[PDB]
Design an enzyme around this catalytic site. Sequence first.
Site, PDB file in Angstrom:
ATOM      1  N   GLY A   1       0.788  -1.223   0.000  1.00 51.86           N
ATOM      2  CA  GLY A   1       0.000   0.000   0.000  1.00 51.86           C
ATOM      3  C   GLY A   1       0.828   1.285   0.000  1.00 51.86           C
ATOM      4  O   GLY A   1       2.019   1.295   0.297  1.00 51.86           O
ATOM      5  N   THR A   2       0.176   2.405  -0.268  1.00 48.88           N
ATOM      6  CA  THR A   2       0.782   3.741  -0.152  1.00 48.88           C
ATOM      7  C   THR A   2       1.255   3.992   1.267  1.00 48.88           C
ATOM      8  O   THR A   2       0.533   3.693   2.217  1.00 48.88           O
ATOM      9  CB  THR A   2      -0.207   4.844  -0.540  1.00 48.88           C
TER      10      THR A   2
END
Lengths: 78, 249, 225, 243, 165, 234, 234
Positions: D29-30
């Site tokens: 994920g970011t």
Amino acid sequence: MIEHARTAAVTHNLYYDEDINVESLTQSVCDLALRFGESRPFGVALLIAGHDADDGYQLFHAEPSGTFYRYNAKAIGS
Amino acid sequence: AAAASAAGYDRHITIFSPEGRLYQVEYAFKATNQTNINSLAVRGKDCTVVISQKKVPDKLLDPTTVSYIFCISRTIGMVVNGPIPDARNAALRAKAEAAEFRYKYGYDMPCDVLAKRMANLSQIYTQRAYMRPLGVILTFVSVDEELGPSIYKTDPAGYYVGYKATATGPKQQEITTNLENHFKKSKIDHINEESWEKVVEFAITHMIDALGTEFSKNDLEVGVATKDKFFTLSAENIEERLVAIAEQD
Amino acid sequence: QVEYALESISHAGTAIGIMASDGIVLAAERKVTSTLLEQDTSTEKLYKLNDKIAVAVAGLTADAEILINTARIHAQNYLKTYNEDIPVEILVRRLSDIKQGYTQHGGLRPFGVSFIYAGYDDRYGYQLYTSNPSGNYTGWKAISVGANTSAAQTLLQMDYKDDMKVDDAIELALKTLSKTTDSSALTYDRLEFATIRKGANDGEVYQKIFKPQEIKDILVKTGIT
Amino acid sequence: TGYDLSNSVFSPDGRNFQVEYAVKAVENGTTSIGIKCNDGVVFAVEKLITSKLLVPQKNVKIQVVDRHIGCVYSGLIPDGRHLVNRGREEAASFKKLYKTPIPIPAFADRLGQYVQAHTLYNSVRPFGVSTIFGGVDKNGAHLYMLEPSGSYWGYKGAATGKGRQSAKAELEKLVDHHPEGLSAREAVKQAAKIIYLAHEDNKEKDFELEISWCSLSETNGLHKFVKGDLLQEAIDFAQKEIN
Amino acid sequence: TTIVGVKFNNGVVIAADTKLHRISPKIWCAGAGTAADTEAVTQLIGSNIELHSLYTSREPRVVSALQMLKQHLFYLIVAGVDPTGSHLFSIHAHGSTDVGYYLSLGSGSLAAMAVLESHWKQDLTKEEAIKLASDAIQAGIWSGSNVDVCVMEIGKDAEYLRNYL
Amino acid sequence: KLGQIDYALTAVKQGVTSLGIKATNGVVIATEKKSSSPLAMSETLSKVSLLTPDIGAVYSGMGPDYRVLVDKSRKVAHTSYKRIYGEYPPTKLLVSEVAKIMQEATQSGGVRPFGVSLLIAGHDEFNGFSLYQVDPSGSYFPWKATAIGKGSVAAKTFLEKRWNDELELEDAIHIALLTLKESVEGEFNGDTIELAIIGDENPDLLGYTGIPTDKGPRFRKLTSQEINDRLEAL
Amino acid sequence: MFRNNYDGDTVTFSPTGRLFQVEYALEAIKQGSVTVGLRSNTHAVLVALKRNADELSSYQKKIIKCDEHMGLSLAGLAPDARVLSNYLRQQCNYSSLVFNRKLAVERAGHLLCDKAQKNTQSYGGRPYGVGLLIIGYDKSGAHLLEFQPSGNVTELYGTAIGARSQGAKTYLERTLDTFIKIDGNPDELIKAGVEAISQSLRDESLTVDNLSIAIVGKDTPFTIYDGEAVAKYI
């Protein structure tokens, strides 16, 4: 599918005092195949024919997938 | 979170092996060692004491939140040996069980009926192929008014028993052998001191002597069971016990 | 699709039913069992349904006792309903239909048992029947179920006469069992025995399910020691 | 050898491999972080710009729960949305029953219990998210990170996603060099620096820095977004520092 | 109507005219209603309290008998001896409970309470308590023979006497 | 041929030995109590249980399963007979309900059999004294004497040598303590043995007096001192 | 020659954090005919290329009305588009009678995400295999949403989904500054959408029955054009 379609026709008749549209009955037998009675296929291909005052003379192929098409002419089986 | 039909082999669900073993339950015993925390519980003359190691290597944690000692009701507490999510589940269950009992039966949940209830819940998780065992050992402590100073320990199989003293964790066998050799010497079923200040002091000594490491205030946790109060020591109160061990010898 | 349940009963000790011109005769043999397993119990072979009807069983007592209790309940209910006791044919058909259902319905298992229903009622007189896991039943002059069925039915066929007395049916059941015994002698403790006869002298149906001493007495009549 | 195919199972080590695999989803994920201030919390995230067609003011990575709890997550996007909805309704439930804003520790436990339940049954999978959340209540500032196992702790600063290694290492320097605790204005600047430093491992994609804060002095203890000149001042700090 | 109860110096008493409401070996009742009592509530609580005893491995407390009465009646008197010591309670259709050194209820009550108040002692020995209970119900009378009694001393198995006067 | 019940039987054949013996005037049920640690307080778990004042049980196999079984068996003896018939069951009725509980687990998919075999012993007015073995299958058998667990083959050979129709309850206790002595894993004393009788009634253990109808427990767990008194001769 | 062990169920994770069964449900979107959506500030437009089974067949429905202010389209699966679209109709009717509001199109998005993510988390079920483009108007202006069967929804100025959509999507990305400034003129926004869908028809040609169009915003209810009504846009 036939005795579901029969029970669907008589229940619409006594609700609206009017004949069931052929699309709406075709939709009802397809919903039975999505429910599996109560991603599986269910039962057999049907040709469904009828007349109603809105969309005239109509012929539908109702499929084991619980989906359908209207045809001007259709052959099924051998 | 509903029950449903699904498949498994004799070591992926709780089912008897060809030799009558339940592997899913024996593997939940290995899950209890995961935090690498030792704990110790001992009975005083009119109290019962629970000491836990505290590990907070990560400088980015607030150390105040890292806690393996739980307050179940005014009279009763526990230490959990196992993963924190399962510990918080078992704590929320034991709090609800104790509140429902004080409502129905009209006296505070004894420590022998809470361990039994939690061990009966763990037996339902040991025969269920749709739900797992918890990876936890639960040690319950109180100064009961029926049996006095009480330690009860419950495990992922739903076995439980009462204890004179106990230790739980990765190095527990040395703590246990050093406790066995203490009771073989003193011949009491408890630590013969009249104040919780001297028992929490004796337990910290045995924990140091067994583990071979000194504790800062922050490397230890403490529980002090007295009639109508189970409580946990703040770090400045634990400092008193640690400062009373250095001055003594 | 039930033939394994018919295999099951073939091991389960032996029961003989023989119908005379004036009665019926049930005999059955207990399997030899562990010294410490209790014998003085309700799980036997020769049971009862009402004062006019008796059964002998092959197959497991746990499947037998449910049907025996259902039969006792249905027979009590019939006597309560009509003040004349249930016909033997209606009892066996009622018990043949319950058993058929549990064989055709795949949510259930076939009952691993086969009872020989002896009885009397005035609509057909003395009635000897057999029923098996399939839910079929047949009327007989003599029959046997369970262990040594084949050997026993030949000895039944070559000695049975339609005119025989109840006392001849006592002899024939005892002599059949002593011909086809798995133990090389026969004894009163392995043998369960019953009769259905026409009263002391007046018109009533008289059952006896024989006590161990009465069994010893008919064994020493019949020359089995 | 089949211990890793379904959710209830313990491996022979006594660990749940489907939750080990759920945190691999979080690690893709970011990057997102939180900072605990003297009187509040600052949250920051790298919002990857996937195309010009996304409506720029309506894709927001930072999520609001009640009015005092800020939230951010890394990993599965439908799973993060579901924990944020559980969160909003769990906070609205407490606000309806007790008439007072939910304690951040009590809110955290209600989520921890929810996420832990999804590790019990093989009829479900774990959540593929780690959530960083936090706020201000009657006891002051709280910052929490909650993981796929239902595990959660309180933090001084928290980092999750692809850039978490570099972010953790920088956050340790903030804690070492400011041992009294940071002001909310400096925590905003310093959070921008850590998201730019996390993006240098991923320079191939464009990103928007997104910041929010919840501080008893700067925001009255209500969670709000960092907008206009302070955001640009924090960008210009991150931009001189990344040189 | 029948009731006098006496929380004496080592135990408790309740007397009645010819109650038999044995909730547990150490817990007893008396009551006016009689058809909702005996069968129904005292049989039904008696099961739950023996299961509670077998489950918890401890004597059943009178406060547990009270809780279960109040929630299972959702005008009795209750008496018994716990590990806590001796108790006497009465329960009301309001959903309430009270505790007294002694009690009486029904039509004879004020006359019995005068006889009680005339003779109570905080050091009252059991035969004196049994006598006070006896004689306060005797003063309540001009069902059956005049007196029966139940007595529960702190150390001892309960004594019920099928008649006393 | 093996399935999940043959594995539950192997859990029983691995479990600590217990036995039952029926005498002319009563029944014995007996077992070893094995400690996980010398810091464990062995009084705080009971191997032998009261089901009704005239029915008792002992197990072999998985102790936690037996504890949930006996809680359900007690609830079964209450909701069934005390709460509608007004009186406790015959041993046959309660053994059928225990076997119904055990069969329900072996039947339901997503459940496993109970990993215990039970010896249930008791008294009844019509049937008198009785002893039954209940297996993980949910099957039940009546016995003159029996043993379950590790020592069961040697124990059942000694029970076959020593049982007769004329034994008194006091001599059946001597046979039981001799049978437990040979199989003992730990130490042999009144703190490692657990032993009960169903025999004569005990009016003291009624815990109240007066009402002539009640007679108190037929069931009695022996104290450790009573066991040690018998062990001085044993 | 290969055997994916981690794609059998919607509840398995890959050792790398992948839900393969949800990815295969995204691959199902590329099985249906192309649809385009685009928006300005005053209007939002759907356009869809409808397939048929045979020359005797009627055309398959691509566009559905959920309420007077919103509706969607359905590439990939047809029957999975009616389960979602029926639920979206129910939730609009419910918002009118319970709150006296038109359902916000963002609120409708969350309700689809919620329904879709539940199927992604539970055994025996399958992630939806349909991609929705939802258009609507509400008090925040004109909106377009792309729903993905994983349980995700995105606010876009325009997009395309279905087989060979990258052509139309690449035209919209190149034309963006132009079609987002088409305000107070609905026909030019329809023509910009029909030119975008013409970039995905690789050699193919629009016809009255092969083309369907829908528009919503400002004074205009959600309307669908197909058959002779699309004749001025061919």
